[PDB]
Write an enzyme that holds these catalytic residues in place. Structure first.
Site, mmCIF file in Angstrom:
data_model
loop_
_atom_site.group_PDB
_atom_site.id
_atom_site.type_symbol
_atom_site.label_atom_id
_atom_site.label_comp_id
_atom_site.label_asym_id
_atom_site.label_seq_id
_atom_site.Cartn_x
_atom_site.Cartn_y
_atom_site.Cartn_z
ATOM 1 N N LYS E 5 1.020 -1.770 0.101
ATOM 2 C CA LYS E 5 0.117 0.053 -0.322
ATOM 3 C C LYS E 5 0.814 0.943 0.058
ATOM 4 N N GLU E 31 0.320 6.580 10.852
ATOM 5 C CA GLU E 31 0.580 5.513 10.259
ATOM 6 C C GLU E 31 2.333 5.657 11.168
ATOM 7 N N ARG E 32 2.849 4.515 10.533
ATOM 8 C CA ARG E 32 4.237 5.185 11.351
ATOM 9 C C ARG E 32 5.502 6.545 11.139
#
Lengths: 272, 47, 156, 54, 161, 120
Positions: E5, E31-32
């Protein structure tokens, strides 16, 4: 496992069962055709063997050159067809070499080659594949005999191992001797036959070799198709039992998942 | 509960890996044969 | 202390008669295990912290006694008696350098002799049957066994 | 002739088996000596660790 | 997780955004942070983010997964607001990348139980569909502008259902 | 990075055709895959220096172990490590310090492995 694991496994087994049912039907049709074509070839091959059992020919006990032919097919999934033939071939080869002979091997069909490619890997005079895709004809036996004679391994005694077709459910493994004209010429029972020099007799031996190979091909293909039908039927039955068990497990797991999710919802609702 | 096409390789059990290998070995063999033919055609068409 | 003469192994394996490989492989394995052991052991025995230790004990006199006895007392070391195989080396000099070398060289000498004898001969278009009889004693027709003409067994 | 020449070539290097034996014996004695050293060391340290633990 | 993704969305930014005349917006939702820094530096290197001039073509909004649920549930709306302004007032094409738009839902689910709502089918808030609709319905190409929205959507345990 | 890349490709190819067990090419592919697989095994509380890992993986991936049986690969790995850690400490130091398999380092590694394989 979890519900998705069980669902995927159940779907896979259902597909497998469908495929095995279809293959059983195909094998049954091919079996019916093979029996129909085997009757006339049965009479023809028995006639071609008539001479040797009528003029009893004893192989000489002073010769070292022997030939083993083992008839099978390329197709698998036929149960213990190739297994029995290969087992008897290695039995006979061991016996001959223990008696101090020089055995070779011809493998009519891949599976025979494969079963014997670990031991006896060097005795393969020549092997034939593409068997079993279509019903064997006299052309195939002529080619096998032609490549046996052309390949200059002049053998002194012979044997062919095939699965004689007894009944739709049973078959037997045979060993039909093959003689070289050296044994026919020097046989006293043969002194009665008239108009027989050592050239007409050579053509006769070549033809009888083709005949015996063709007979073995027809018997072997009939027995193989019968065995494949039986094996597919048993595999479909096993897949059906496994499908029943997995369906029971799937239903248990589905109910358990419904209950678990519902209890989670209830606990959350009552814990406010 | 039903079954669908391409499910044997979706489970990934023993039959899935067995089928994957039965396919890969055959197509590696055919790729080798086709590469040999391609080399032969290359050499035969230089002139 | 330690400086071990290097070895070539593929070279080493060329010098074992078939009757002696059963001991050669065992010796190889024993060498392997011992070398692994030696690698396992450290380059030195680790030191001892006598000061701190005797500072962390009540009967400092007893630990001092142990320290001093340790300092005075040493450990023994084995000898080369198990290396009696010294003798074998000399024996080998006999086969390798005295016996096998000498008869091998004489056999060489003879093989040369024969080679130059066989290389210096008249063109065959000029030779005579006596000459074949002498150069090749295989073409002689023994009269002692076939006195009559042709002296050959005609079935030949 | 060439077979004999090769045999003679091997004669020169015949000595490697004895060489291997010598290396093995020497380093085995060395291993035993180091084991003795470390064994006395370990026993004495355990010996005195007795007293400190007490 | 681990199917591509983020790599695919970065690839799209590489292709479409680099050669796209209009502006662009990247809202990193839950997200990270490593990936946020990597994107910042990759964009600086490419040149879409110019730290010297006023020629930057990308506006970034970050609500990474170290933030409490309240911030993850709203960083999507912040990025969406920036994109909406560029759509309407600037009257121009816009791109809008979001990664992932599942963390918006999940962050909404981490506080619902504490707000007094009974949970729904699988530990989700009762307002899942309405909460997602009231956001996804502002990411649209009206007749005044045009937002091309690319969304990465985590599928928990590969379960598309 | 240099060595593990080729090892990764070789295991990736091996894992495809693994479920069974003919031709020379695929037979050798399976052989190499199995050799690498038994190369990756390890014991407990005995981690390896990176250069030692590089040496072992290089030996395994450069077709050297393809001659050996796969049940003996552990014996090789261990003995090769013990041999290199003493005789060729200099090469390992070179690999660690320079942090790459230079051409001269590769040629050395080549000759060490060729000598050791026969001598075992």
């Amino acid at each position: 496992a979890t519900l998705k694991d069980i669902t995927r496994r159940l779907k896979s087994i259902k597909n497998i069962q469908k495929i095995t049912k279809s293959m059983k039907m195909v094998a049954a049709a091919k079996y019916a055709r093979a029996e129909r074509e085997l009757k006339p070839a049965r009479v023809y091959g028995v006639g071609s063997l008539a001479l040797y059992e009528k003029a009893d020919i004893k192989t000489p006990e002073d010769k070292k050159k022997h030939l083993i032919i083992g008839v099978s097919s390329d197709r698998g999934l036929c149960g213990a067809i190739h297994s029995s033939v290969a087992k008897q071939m290695k039995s006979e080869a061991a016996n001959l070499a223990a008696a101090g002979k020089e055995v070779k091997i011809i493998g009519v069909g891949d599976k025979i080659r494969s079963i014997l490619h670990r031991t006896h890997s060097d005795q393969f005079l020549v092997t034939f594949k593409e068997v079993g895709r279509r019903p064997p004809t006299f052309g195939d036996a002529s080619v096998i005999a032609l490549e046996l004679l052309n390949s200059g391994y002049e053998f002194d005694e012979g044997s062919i191992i095939f699965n004689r077709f007894r009944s739709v459910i049973s078959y037997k493994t045979e060993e039909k001797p093959i003689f070289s004209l050296d044994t026919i010429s020097s046989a006293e029972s043969m002194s009665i036959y008239d108009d027989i020099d050592a050239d007409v007799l050579r053509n006769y031996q070549e033809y009888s070799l083709a005949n015996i190979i063709y007979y073995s091909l027809k018997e072997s293909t009939t027995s193989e198709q019968s065995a494949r039908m039986t094996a597919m039927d048993n595999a479909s039955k096993n897949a059906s039992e496994m499908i029943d068990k997995l369906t029971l497990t799937f239903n248990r797991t589905r109910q358990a998942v419904i209950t678990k999710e519902l209890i989670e919802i209830i606990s959350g609702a009552a814990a406010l | 509960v039903r079954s669908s096409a391409g499910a044997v390789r979706d489970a990934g059990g023993a039959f899935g890996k067995r089928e994957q290998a039965e396919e890969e070995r055959y197509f590696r063999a055919r790729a080798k044969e086709q590469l040999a033919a391609l080399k032969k055609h290359h050499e035969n068409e230089i002139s | 202390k330690l400086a071990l003469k290097t070895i070539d192994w593929v070279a080493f394996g060329e010098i074992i008669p078939r009757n002696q490989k059963a001991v050669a492989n065992s010796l190889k394995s024993w060498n392997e295990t011992l070398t692994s052991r030696l690698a396992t052991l450290p380059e030195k025995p680790p030191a001892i912290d006598w000061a701190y230790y005797k500072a962390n004990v009540a009967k400092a006199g007893l630990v001092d006694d142990f320290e001093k006895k340790f300092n005075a007392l040493k450990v023994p070391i084995p000898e080369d008696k198990y290396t009696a195989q010294v003798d074998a080396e000399e024996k080998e000099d006999v086969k390798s350098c005295a016996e096998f070398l000498t008869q091998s060289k004489t056999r060489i000498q003879e093989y040369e002799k024969e080679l130059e004898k066989m290389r210096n001969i008249i063109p065959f278009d000029q030779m005579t049957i006596e000459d074949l009889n002498e150069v090749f004693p295989e073409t002689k027709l023994d009269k002692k066994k076939y006195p009559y003409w042709p002296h050959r067994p005609i079935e030949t | 002739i060439d077979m004999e020449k090769s045999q003679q070539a091997l004669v020169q290097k015949r000595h490697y088996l004895f060489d291997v034996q010598r290396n093995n014996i020497a380093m085995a004695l060395e291993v035993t000596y180091r084991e003795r050293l470390h064994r006395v060391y370990r026993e004495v340290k355990n010996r005195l660790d007795y007293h400190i633990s007490v | 997780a681990g199917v591509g993704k983020t790599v695919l969305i970065m690839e799209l930014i590489n292709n479409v955004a680099k050669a796209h005349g209009g502006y662009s917006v990247f809202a990193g939702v839950g997200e990270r942070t490593r990936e946020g820094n990597d994107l910042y530096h990759e964009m600086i290197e490419s040149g879409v983010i110019n730290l010297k001039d006023a020629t930057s073509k990308v506006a970034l909004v970050y609500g990474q997964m170290n933030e409490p649920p309240g911030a993850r549930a709203r960083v999507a709306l912040t990025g969406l607001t920036v994109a909406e302004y560029f759509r309407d007032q600037e009257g121009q094409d816009v791109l809008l990348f979001i990664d992932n738009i599942f963390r918006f839902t999940q962050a909404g689910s981490e506080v619902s139980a504490l707000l007094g709502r009974i949970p729904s089918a699988v530990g989700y808030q009762p307002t899942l569909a309405t909460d997602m609709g009231t956001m996804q319905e502002r990411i649209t190409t009206t007749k005044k502008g045009s937002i091309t929205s690319v969304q990465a959507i985590y599928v928990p345990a590969d379960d598309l259902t | 990075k240099q060595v593990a890349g080729t090892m990764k490709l070789e295991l990736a190819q091996y894992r495809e055709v693994a479920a069974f067990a003919l031709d020379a090419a695929t037979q050798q592919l399976l052989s190499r895959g199995v050799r690498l697989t038994e190369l990756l095994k390890q014991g407990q509380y005995s981690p390896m220096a990176i250069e030692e890992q590089v040496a072992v993986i290089y030996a395994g991936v450069r077709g050297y172990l393809d001659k050996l049986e796969p049940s003996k690969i552990t014996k090789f790995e261990n003995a090769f490590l013990s041999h290199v850690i003493s005789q060729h400490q200099a090469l390992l130091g070179k690999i660690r310090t320079d942090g790459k398999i230079s051409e001269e380092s590769d040629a050395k590694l080549k000759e060490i492995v060729t000598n050791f394989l026969a001598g075992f």
